[PDB]
């Protein structure tokens, strides 16, 4: 298939998705992250620092009161609601909305991701090797068809004493 270039020219509109999940697709639960690697936590700031970010309402509402806005970063935040408000960042009520920029990366959560699949010509995935199973409820990260191509990384050791590996995906 027709080769991509990582060069982004400023007239265009690259659209990607960075997300962790655990082996069994689950990317959230109550609200909450399940797990915390400080390889993961560094390898989202490489990757998002100086772009913009676009998240769902309920990932805007899963950061701390005190860390939102991300720093570094254009936040945008996802919401229907024409009352919901995201102090220090613009809410928008649709993807089209959002994606103005040159460089966009869509950080969830499970709604989003599914929403902007679409539009995405990269995804960049942690995979964490903890056992958890999948619940009624829980966000879950996109599956990703066979127009993507991928580079999976080996398994790694974090120090918080997870297997983790990454994956880098792209596609037209
Ligand atoms: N592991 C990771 O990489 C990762 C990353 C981020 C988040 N998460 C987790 O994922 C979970 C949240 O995911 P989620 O799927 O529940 O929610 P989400 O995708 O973060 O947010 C969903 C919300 O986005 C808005 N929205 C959705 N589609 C829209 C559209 N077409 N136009 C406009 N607004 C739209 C709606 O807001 P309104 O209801 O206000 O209308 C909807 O309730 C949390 O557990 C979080 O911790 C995990
Ligand atoms: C690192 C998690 C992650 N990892 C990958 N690979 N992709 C993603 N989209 C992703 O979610 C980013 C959005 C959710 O962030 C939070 C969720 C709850 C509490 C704190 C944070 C802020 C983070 C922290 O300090 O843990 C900070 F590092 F961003
Ligand atoms: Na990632």
Known sequence: ???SSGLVPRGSH???LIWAQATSGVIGRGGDIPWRLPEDQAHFREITMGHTIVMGRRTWDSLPAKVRPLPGRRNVVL???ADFMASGAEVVGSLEEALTSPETW???GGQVYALALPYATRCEVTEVDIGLPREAGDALAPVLDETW???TGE???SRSGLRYRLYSYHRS
């Open 1 to 3: 298939h027709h080769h």
């Open 14 to 16: 690259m659209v990607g």
């Open 79 to 81: 919401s229907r609601q």
């Open 106 to 108: 869509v950080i969830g």
């Open 149 to 151: 191509r991928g580079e």
């Open 155 to 157: 398994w790694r050791f």
